[PDB]
Amino acid sequence: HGSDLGKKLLEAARAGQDDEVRILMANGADVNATDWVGMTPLHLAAWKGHLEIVEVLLKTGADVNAHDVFGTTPLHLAAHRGHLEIVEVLLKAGADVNAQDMVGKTPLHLAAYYGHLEIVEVLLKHGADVNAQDKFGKTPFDLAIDNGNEDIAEVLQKAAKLNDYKD
Amino acid sequence: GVIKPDMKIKLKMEGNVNGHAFVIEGEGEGKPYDGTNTINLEVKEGAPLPFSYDILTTAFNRAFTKYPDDIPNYFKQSFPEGYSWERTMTFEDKGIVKVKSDISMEEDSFIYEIHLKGENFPPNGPVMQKKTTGWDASTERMYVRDGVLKGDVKHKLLLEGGGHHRVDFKTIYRAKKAVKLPDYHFVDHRIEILNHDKDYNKVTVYESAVARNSTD
């Protein structure tokens, strides 16, 4: 059954077993298996930084924009952890750069908060809304400032100024 | 070892209960081998909370559990790398909370990153009307499934009238490295709010927890 292997797939992705993952998928494992808190294999690989498994899962049909029960997407998780390469392949595979989680945070909010400058730059380059507000009215700039990530705060402030000059 | 007799606690919770988003940060301390800890919590976003704080307090680390030496300690063995846990609390009037927490360690401090979602609480039930008084003492059954540790509690949430609201806890605890797995056993709990300001923007939580074998 797709389902019962799906559950082993979740475990293999969570443990980092690139080979297991590939074996399970070859035998029909449901790439979009979910657990009771809404994590998918792709979420787990994106959080753990298992780039090769992320790529494999995307190529075999994983939903790049699946949200867990907290509204978290794989792109949120890679951005939160600073997995630049995974952020790049997720965006190339169609990830919503401006997805909001249950407290209104976008991937750019998280990259700014957790101090991942290169991710900030990739996300803005892919159309991340620099003025996105979470549920408390905070921007990625506000979070950068609150955590002392001044270089990121400078990048965000400049992108916000420049953005005022569109049509 | 890496877990000292005194350990500090730092945590953040991102939350959304019946659509109300909030952020809570805490700092605390406890004694892991005695099974006791206290945490001072402050609502940083989304103040004042429009629901019972009691649905949050058990989300605010089983490293703080007194374990006898004949039960392997799933939680303390997992460090320094740590462990994560996932929990569902099913309330009598169909309210549900889902909670996830990631527990790491930095020097002499545990660090918790918590996400908590509450939904389907009746707008006029005791959670959303803030008519709870606290949790009863409880006993969690710990048992191994799928190579990880599970905990079940048939809990009671005590209500201002003197009655109670049944709440079922299911938790999955996942060590980040291989550890010696215990047999079935119990963890007795007592959790208490030691202080709160009027709106519960500032709260201090206390918990004690002791493990014991199934026969006794």
Numbering used by the authors:
A (entry chain B): 12 to 178
B (entry chain A): 2 to 61, 65 to 220
Which passages does the manuscript contain on this structure?
Here, we report the selection of designed ankyrin repeat proteins (DARPins) recognizing mTFP1 (monomeric teal fluorescent protein 1). Here, we report the selection of DARPins recognizing mTFP1, one of the brightest and most photostable FPs in the blue-green spectrum. We characterized these binders both biochemically and biophysically and determined the three-dimensional structure of one DARPin-mTFP1 complex. The two DARPins we report here bind specifically and with high affinity to mTFP1.
Using X-ray crystallography, we obtained a crystal structure for the tightest-binding mTFP1 binding DARPin 1238_E11 in complex with mTFP1. The mTFP1/DARPin 1238_E11 complex was obtained by mixing mTFP1 with a 1.2-fold excess of DARPin 1238_E11 and subjecting the mixture to gel filtration. Gel filtration analysis indicated a homogeneous 1:1 complex, which was used for crystallization as described in Materials and Methods. We determined the crystal structure of the mTFP1/-DARPin 1238_E11 complex in two space groups, to 1.6 Å (P6522) and 1.85 Å (C2) resolution, respectively. Both complex structures are structurally identical (Cα r.m.s.d. of 0.3 Å): The overall fold of mTFP1 exhibits the typical β-can motif of the GFP family and undergoes only minor structural changes upon DARPin binding. DARPin 1238_E11 binds into a cavity along mTFP1 including β-strands 1, 4, 5 and 6, comprising a protein-protein binding surface of 790 Å2 and thus similar in size compared to other known DARPin protein complexes. Residues from the N-Cap and the three DARPin repeats make specific contacts with mTFP1. Interactions involve hydrophobic DARPin residues Trp37, Val38, Phe71, Met103 and Val104, two salt bridges (Asp69-Lys104 and Lys106-Glu15) and an arginine-arginine paring (Arg15-Arg178) stabilized by Glu90. DARPin 1238_E11 binds along the barrel of mTFP1, using hydrophobic and charge complementation. Comparison to the crystal structures of the individual proteins showed no significant structural changes for both proteins upon complex formation.
